[PDB]
Design a protein around this ligand. Structure first.
Ligand SMILES: *C(=O)[C@H]([C@@H](C)O)[C@@]1(C)CC(S[C@@H]2CN[C@H](C(=O)N(C)C)C2)=C(C(=O)O)N1
Length: 243
């Protein structure tokens, strides 16, 4: 319809290859400039923090209350040089905290758990704190959107209290009683770079619309574009109107 055309017209000014997938529990829908991205596997990058938190809370390797203290070594980013709960680190996307969480899980458990839940190609390689950053773990946008849809509904194979804790770590904003949850990612260690904005909108209706923006990135690109483009799309779709 015209709203489909409204959404496609947003991408006609985006020069990068991009797909935007939505999932409402019945139908997958695809928008953007390169629709085959939706069935292509990319590294999860920072969106893997969702599965990381779930696995780590599920297996008694952290709680949502524990402080991950900074060990005094200046990190790549400076605003990471502080203490973090898992939730505070989710919003700050603090990779060293989630690397430490991966090391608490260990390669053996991490592997069996990715297999158990069927996350992407379920491949971890030999370095337990790098596989979502460099490969070999990859996942398609359609797999992400179905992953987080189930998270929204409490239907992933984890304890419901664990899903609820991780779900609220992703809380972004609400408009009336519609709630946006989302996690961004920018995998810079691979060629080509991959950009993600994945999440879901929970309506007061209880209905959920999960979404995944996935696009080619290159150095110097606007870090705010992924989020701003996704909110534009969600507004044009009528899933998450601007106020
Ligand atoms: C996650 O996908 C990614 C890596 C480190 O795992 C992460 C957390 C980095 C970035 S943006 C990058 C780090 N901070 C820089 C910055 O803000 N400026 C202005 C220099 C750029 C993201 C992201 O999603 O934006 N994810």
């Amino acid at each position: 319809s015209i709203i489909d055309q409204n959404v496609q017209a947003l991408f006609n000014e985006i020069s990068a290859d991009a797909v935007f997938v939505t999932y409402d529990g019945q139908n997958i829908k695809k928008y953007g400039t390169h629709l085959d991205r939706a069935k292509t596997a990319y590294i999860p990058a920072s969106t893997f923090k969702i599965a990381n938190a779930l696995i780590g809370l599920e297996n008694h390797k952290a709680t949502s209350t524990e402080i991950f203290k900074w060990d005094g070594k200046p990190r790549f980013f400076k605003a990471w040089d502080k203490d973090f709960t898992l939730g505070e680190a989710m919003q700050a996307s603090t990779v060293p905290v989630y690397q430490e969480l991966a090391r608490r899980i260990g390669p053996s458990l991490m592997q069996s758990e990715l297999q158990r839940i069927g996350y992407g190609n379920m491949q971890i390689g030999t370095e337990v704190d790098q596989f979502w950053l460099k490969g070999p773990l990859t996942i398609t946008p359609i797999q992400e959107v179905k992953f987080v849809y189930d998270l929204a509904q409490g239907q992933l194979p984890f304890k419901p209290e664990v899903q609820q804790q991780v779900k609220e770590m992703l809380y972004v904003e609400r408009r009336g009683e519609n709630r946006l949850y989302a996690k961004s990612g920018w995998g810079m260690a691979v060629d080509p770079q991959v950009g993600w904005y994945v999440g879901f909108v929970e309506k007061a209706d209880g209905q959920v619309v999960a979404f995944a923006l996935n696009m080619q990135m290159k150095a110097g690109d606007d870090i705010a574009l992924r989020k701003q483009l996704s909110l534009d799309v969600l507004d044009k779709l009528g899933v998450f109107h601007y106020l």
